[PDB]
Design an enzyme around this catalytic site. Sequence first.
Site: not given
Length: 495
Positions: A68, A45, A70
Amino acid sequence: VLANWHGHDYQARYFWIEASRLKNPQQDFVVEVSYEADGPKAFDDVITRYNPPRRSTGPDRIQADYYQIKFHVTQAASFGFEDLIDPAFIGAETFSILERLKQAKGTEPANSAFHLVTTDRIIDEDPLGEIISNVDGSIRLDKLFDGTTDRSRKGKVRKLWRQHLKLSTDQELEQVLSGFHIQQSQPTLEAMREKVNTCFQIIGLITCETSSDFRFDGAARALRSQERYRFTREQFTALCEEENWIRSEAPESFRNVALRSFSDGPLDIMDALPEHTLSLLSLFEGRFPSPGIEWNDVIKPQVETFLTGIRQTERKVRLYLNTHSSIAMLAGKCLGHKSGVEIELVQKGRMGDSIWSENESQDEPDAVIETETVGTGSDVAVVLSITRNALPKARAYILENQPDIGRIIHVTPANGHGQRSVKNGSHAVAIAEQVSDVVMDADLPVEASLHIFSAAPNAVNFYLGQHTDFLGTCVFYEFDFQRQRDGSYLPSFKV
Ligand SMILES: [Cl-]
């Protein structure tokens, strides 16, 4: 109306915060920042790459941090170890967080760090809370790998994860988990907007204030449409030039210094070089002592030594502050009006990041100041009600525990306490000056102590600490929501 990133504005702002390092002269080792807007994939990301590899608490210097993120939801939920094997937890039909981790560990260099970023929190009694470091979010391998069997409390975690990943031994699981971090309770979206603005101002870019729509969110969507996903330092400078974002190409060079006493999130861990950083929670190995004797005997010498070292070599300091109120006040005392150090404060916290200095002027009315006699003793209390009315709790503590206090001085901003009761650094300094004038006019004898109770953000407490040198013997206090379920004061530093 363009296509959003899969992580939307939260991911875009995380990327901007990381990319600002590409134009930060004090973080020249950050060589590339990239984002993956067509995800989620495997911890890409945001990716921040370092050359030379960045300093690390571990044995190997780290060539990259992989994030990463969320998918951000305003209402924060809870999660536990069982959620790390569920694809829905990362908003996908297949591949959980741990499977993405195993894949990324398969592809990326060995000296890499991988972070799960979420605004949610770990369930209070879940085993995951016991294996995630309060210092830096890293997995606690010594804690998860007990040497027990699958029946034990950590064994159930090991079994679930090992079998989900189709591994044969707990040793292979430990290999997979090395370098993994969970950053829980990350800042809200609005705090992220404030952090983007603070980072951009510090590196000399324009900021987007007041406007209800953030300019850089649309800028990130446009970058995605242009298929520009990765940026070196030269590429980011070129983007800033093309966009007309550069406010000043040579802002006043302050030495970055960091003073923290809470968790070291990845967004803030590199604010200053290690030799210019004091992270108190790391020194206590994740267990911060309760306010009292340990503060005056351990924390105070550490802070004083650190700031004396800073003071004797640095003329201009940008102080990143994320600490307890009385520690911020002590810091102000160490870098006070005597030091000759020009100070720029970066106040970091859950509310967001803000920049404080005495550059902007103010013409606010004087603070309301009211003196009350409560006894015959020669000690004096000063109560600063800036974020909230602190006088009831301070008065209760004083009536119950300080017989030698004879007078309480209550100080409240002209238009009452609140989140934004103090305008800027000049206003905070002026308040500190009128507090000092009142205290000096109170004519305390030299044997008496001034007891300071404050309900204010870190920056205001710092500016007050800068003036405590004019007030003689002082006792700083910490407000704690523990002993009394609605909070009570405890003495911390005696200076
Ligand atoms: Cl098995």
